Structure formats: structure tokens, C-alpha cells
Ligand binder design. Structure first.
Ligand SMILES: [Cl-]
Ligand SMILES: [Mg+2]
Ligand SMILES: [Mg+2]
Lengths: 388, 389
């Protein structure tokens, strides 16, 4: 029995701990008075606090569900979308068919081109909350609601936050000894270049280790192909984000001129974004980010990967643990799942910010027990959240 | 003619009652939702029950004041938050010596996280327009001059037939024809009797020399869109706009390659990247950039790509105070592939009092403002009405 949504409340949660940047701060870099920093290398903006947007959604009968999306930059954007536009269209609906609610909300602004970006960030938080409600009302975990899922799967170390190439290798080794078999490094970081870095990691970790290279977008297809040729002898697991997201022609060119598996997708929003690429390019792996996408989008991307034999290896980012729990629930149902990003500093906050038995130990994620997401914000989180 | 650093960036909304009958479009017992939004059941799209846009006032340390504008009909707090919290801080201290450089820097801040369009570029658009306005004022040149020169007038086509019946819609089109307009567009969903009946009526009323385009409003499968176009084809449609869903590029390829009726798209795009994704697969005859979504930098890059491929440019127009419309006229006038420009008579006319500056449209042609920069600004009356956000 599904009770109608009564209220939708939006919050930000700013954390007392901070995930390090991949790439030490350098001479010339500036902290803007507005609290943001642009990296001189990649030109991308970064926050000086970790922060996410949480949504509390409550039924008339008193069932409480939580959703979460990105809030590191301009959280008032998602907050405005939800408070001014979206909440009003969710209140009165129920959780009998969360995906139908998502589709209705998406369709409202589709023709004006708000098919991704912040609009879908907002839909993501709403969609997760609604599934959390649906699971609780059914007395079922979300993964059971979606037809069943495994209770554990492999995690890989998605980043190595140490300042030197030698230190990054020691950190990788530390995790290897603790059950991890797969690792990834960011190509722009090493002073001596990505070939030098993968060579070192391969030497340190041995032949069996899976070692991927996250190329962080900023290359022409020709340059990307060069870098990949240099890394190739060291048996890279995959090359991620070889060129700019918008440069589909470049992505096509790279993917068809190397046999190294190409992985993309953390910055997508919907299966529509995937269709645009897999129609032209040779994509081995897609890497959806729950916090940007929501459960509905996540499973549609999964289903499409299964139609084409594409591997699914979800991205992770720091948050309170709500969208991560959602990611685990949804990932567990996917036939094409081959792993899931993990970083200690990304995962650790959920220990204090969540109640629930979601865990990551010995190189594997373990799903929480219980209906819905299987988790909820802890008393600590409830004290830190601020309305927006 | 030096460039003074930006000192302040101020965001406002301007909200006003709609002055055109628009609820006549709701026939299935549609209900007003919180904050004044209403969803049309036939197309599932949300609409405001008022007119509203986001205005930006940008001022240099030396006191030059520029204005930009973007969409604000829906959740203007989104763009406002983006500007107030994030973007303003990276514009302040910069100057207008190279507005496109500032645009590229702002766009780059968030592009790898997938904020490559939507409300993010909405926000960049308002900032870009304001910066170009300042650039021109500081150089003592109109924007079009600063961009290498542009025409001072060009054809406008009529859109908006807010009459209940097919006949009255024809009569309305006739009136605008009598005023010197010779190009028109109608929305295919509007006709109870079908797009074929509508174009048939218009063609007869207006005669064979008139340009009559059909806006198909996205909601067809590619096969249904081809059928519809086939039904309209015998009446010489000027172009078929938005035959299928924006996301459905395969369907657009299919439609565009199975009809000789010119295909037009683009109002809901944000950058040349969106264009590239389409023209690389599809047969696009016309692109229809919307300045309020895009900004001048994005608009001229789209026009430049169009020139590379022999694609006509016929820009979109929409609800707004006239600030981004004026920016649209400035940028458009520099484009070799320009063939004309949408004209929303029902918005443009009553909004004259909201602007200072000589932007006009008459005798079927837009007439561009004469002054430096944008050439228009909010009137004293408009300044009385804007609210900070
Ligand atoms: Cl957006
Ligand atoms: Mg990555
Ligand atoms: Mg249109």
C-alpha cells in the first residue's frame, strides 16, 4: 500500500572532513572569495568544503525516504528547482511506480533542453527518495524491488591521493594487501607522465593487478591515442575519459584506433547520453554516477549496457552515503556489473553520517540489510543538515 | 577605450502577467500547481502562468553598465544561485577586452561534471551578453561592429497565431501579411483538424508566394513525423521544425534523410557542440539558435559552423524583456548564413515600454538599435519592476 507524498524538504550537508584533491595545490592557484578554486591545470572548479544536497520526502502516512545529489557547487540551483518547480508535482503522487514519476518530471522541461545538468541532479535526489519510500512500503530492499541483486561485489581503488609517484605506489600496495585487485590513477598528476606512472604501478603491484588510467578529458583524440600507446605495454585495464565529453567524434576516433578498453560516463545523466556515444563509438565500459542520475536512470543505463554487452563499472563521489547506498542497491541488480569505484576518504564519512550496515571491507562492497535503501541519516547528520 | 575591470554583478527577475490568451491551449482540465505552473497534458511540458525572465546588471569599476538576460520562466532561482554563488566571483576582476575568453573559462569550470548545457549555459548566456554590452560601450561600438560589422535590418517571420479557430488564425495571418510580413509559422498541435488542414488554409489565405513553416513540437516518432510532413508537403511548407525529440538523433537522421522538406532545429540547444552532434549524422537545412539560452559567444560559433556547411540560420525568439532579443539581433546581423529571424509580435509590441533604445520591427523586417554595445537597456519603468534574486 502506497501513501501519497505529503512533503518534500531540501537540505545541504557540509562535512567536517575534506577529500583531498588529486593533484597538490601549486604556485599561482587562487582561492576565490566565494569559496571555490579553479585548478590552473584542468581549469575545472573545486569546492573548499565537501557538501551534498539531501532530500527528505515524507508520505501522508509518515513513511520517510531520503534522496541525495551533488551539492559541491551552487546547491541553491538544485534547491530552487525542487522548492519552486518539482516538489509541487511530486506531492500528491505516490511511490507505486517511481519511474513513472521520474518520467513525468523529466518531460516537463525536456523540449527546452534541460535534459541533463542540474535538472537531472534534482530529479536524481527525488527519484532516490521515492524508491526508498517504495521499498519501505513494500517491506523490501530496493534491489529486491528491482527483481533481486547480489549482496556483495568487488570494489576498486578509484584514486591514489598521495603527492608523489612513489607514495602513490605504496598506497596502492597497502590496498592490494587488503583485498583490492584493481586500481586507477589520474594521468595528469605524474610529473614524469602517465607512462612512467603506470610502469611504476605495474612493477609495484605485479602482473595480475588491474590498473586503469583516468585521462581526465583534456586531450585531443590524437594526443589521447599517443598517451594510450605509451601506456599500452604496461597492460592498462581501461583508459577512462580520453577526450572531452562533448567531442563524440574524437571519442569515436580514439575508441576505434586502440584495443585498450575505453570507459566513459560518470558525467552523463541518462540513457540518451549513452545512446549518443554507443551508436558511433567503441565503448567497453560505462561508469554511471548515481548522484547525478538516480535509480531510474541508473537501471536504464544498465539495461542498455546489457543489450550491447557493455561492462558497467559505477563511479563514486563523496557524499553522506545516501546516493552511494542507492548506487549499491541498483548496481547489485545489473548483469553487466564488473566493479564499483571506492576510495577510503569518499566512503568513510558515511560511517558517522549514516545509520545502517552498508560496508566496504577486504576489497568488496557489502549491501545493507533492510527495506528501501537500507540506511538513513544518523543523528549526527540530522544535526548538521541545514535547510535550503 | 580601455577596458575597466568588472566591479559588481547583480541578478534580478522581471515578472509580468501574460497579455496573450494562452490558457485556451489547456483542454483536459489542467490544474494550476504550486508556484503557478501548469502542465499541458497533450505534450507533458510545463508552462508558467506569467511572463518572467532573469536580468543581469554588470558594472565596471569605472561605471560602465551592461545588461544581460536569460530564461526565467521556470525556477529563476536556479540561474540566480549559479550566478550569485559561483559565477559572479569569477567575472569580477575580469574585463571585457575578450568576452569570449571569459565565457570559455566559466564554461570550463563545470564541463567535466556534465553541466554543458541547461541552466548552466542559461547563466553563462546572461553573463556573456552583459560582457559584450560593456565591451561595445567601452570601444564605443555596437556589438555587431565589434564583431566585424553587421547589417542594420533583416527579414522577420511571424509566429504566434493566438486565435481559437482555424479561420480566425488565417485572418490573423492575413493581417500581418497586410503589414508587410511574407513569412509565417504555425504550431502543428494547435489545429483540431490537423497540420494538413491548417497549412492548406494558410496557403490559400496567404497565397503561393508566402513562406509558411510548420513547427512540429517534437512529439512524434520519426515515422509519424514523416507521415505528417508528407501530408503537408503538397502545400509547400517553408520548413518542418523539430520533427522528433531532441534526444532522438537517430530519428532526426531518419526524418531528415527521407524528405526533401527542409528540416530546422536548434532552439533548445546551448552550444556548437549540440549542433556538431546533429549535423554529423543528419541533413539539417536550418538551425534556430535561441539567444536567451546561448549567449553571443555561443551564437556566433553556431553561425560560423553553419557557414562551414551551407546551413541557413533563422534564430528563435521568445518571451523576454528584449535584452537577449537585442543581443540576438546584434549577433545575427553578422552571420553570412542568416536568412531571417523569428518575430513574436505578441511579446515584442507590449514590451516596448520596458526598453530604452531603437530596436524595432516593421514591414516584415527587424531594425537594429543604433548605439554602442547592445543598443538597448531596461527603461525607467522596467527598473521600477525588477526584483533582486
Ligand atoms: Cl540543467
Ligand atoms: Mg573519472
Ligand atoms: Mg519551436
Amino acid at each position: 500500500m502506497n501513501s501519497p507524498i505529503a512533503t518534500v524538504e531540501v537540505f545541504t550537508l557540509t562535512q567536517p572532513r575534506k577529500v583531498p584533491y588529486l593533484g597538490a595545490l601549486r604556485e599561482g592557484e587562487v582561492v576565490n572569495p566565494n569559496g571555490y578554486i579553479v585548478r590552473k591545470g584542468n581549469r575545472t572548479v573545486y569546492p573548499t568544503f565537501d557538501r551534498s544536497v539531501l532530500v527528505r520526502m515524507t508520505t501522508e502516512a509518515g513513511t520517510v525516504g531520503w534522496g541525495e545529489t551533488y551539492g559541491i557547487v551552487a546547491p541553491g540551483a538544485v534547491a530552487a528547482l525542487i522548492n519552486d518547480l518539482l516538489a509541487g508535482f511530486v506531492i500528491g503522487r505516490d511511490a507505486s511506480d517511481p519511474s513513472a514519476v521520474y518520467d513525468d518530471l523529466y518531460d516537463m522541461m525536456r523540449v527546452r533542453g534541460y535534459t541533463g545538468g542540474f535538472y537531472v541532479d534534482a530529479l536524481a535526489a527525488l527519484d532516490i527518495a521515492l524508491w526508498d519510500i517504495a521499498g519501505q512500503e513494500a517491506g523490501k530492499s530496493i534491489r529486491d524491488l528491482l527483481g533481486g541483486g547480489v549482496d556483495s561485489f568487488p570494489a576498486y581503488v578509484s584514486g591514489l591521493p598521495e603527492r608523489t609517484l612513489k607514495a602513490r605506489g605504496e598506497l596502492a600496495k597497502y590496498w592490494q594487501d587488503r583485498g583490492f585487485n584493481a586500481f586507477k590513477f589520474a594521468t595528469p598528476v605524474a610529473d614524469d607522465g602517465p607512462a612512467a606512472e603506470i610502469a611504476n604501478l605495474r612493477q609495484v603491484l605485479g602482473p595480475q593487478a588491474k590498473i586503469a588510467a583516468d585521462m581526465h578529458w583534456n586531450q585531443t583524440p590524437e594526443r589521447a591515442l599517443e598517451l594510450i600507446a605509451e601506456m599500452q605495454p604496461f597492460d592498462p585495464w581501461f583508459a577512462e575519459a580520453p577526450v572531452w565529453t562533448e567531442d563524440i567524434a574524437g571519442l569515436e576516433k580514439v575508441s576505434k584506433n586502440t584495443d585498450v578498453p575505453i570507459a566513459v560516463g560518470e558525467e552523463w545523466r541518462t540513457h540518451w547520453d549513452m545512446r549518443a556515444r554507443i551508436e558511433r563509438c567503441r565503448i567497453a565500459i560505462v561508469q554511471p554516477e548515481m548522484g547525478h542520475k538516480g535509480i531510474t536512470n541508473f537501471i536504464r543505463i544498465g539495461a542498455l549496457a546489457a543489450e550491447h554487452g557493455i561492462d558497467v563499472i559505477p563511479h563514486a563521489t563523496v557524499g553522506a552515503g545516501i546516493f552511494l547506498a542507492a548506487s549499491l542497491q541498483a548496481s547489485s541488480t545489473l548483469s553487466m556489473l564488473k566493479g564499483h569505484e571506492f576510495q577510503h576518504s569518499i566512503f568513510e564519512p558515511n560511517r558517522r553520517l549514516l545509520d545502517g550496515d552498508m560496508d566496504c571491507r577486504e576489497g568488496r562492497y557489502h549491501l545493507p540489510s533492510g527495506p528501501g535503501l537500507g540506511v538513513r541519516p544518523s543523528e549526527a547528520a540530522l544535526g548538521l543538515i541545514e535547510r535550503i
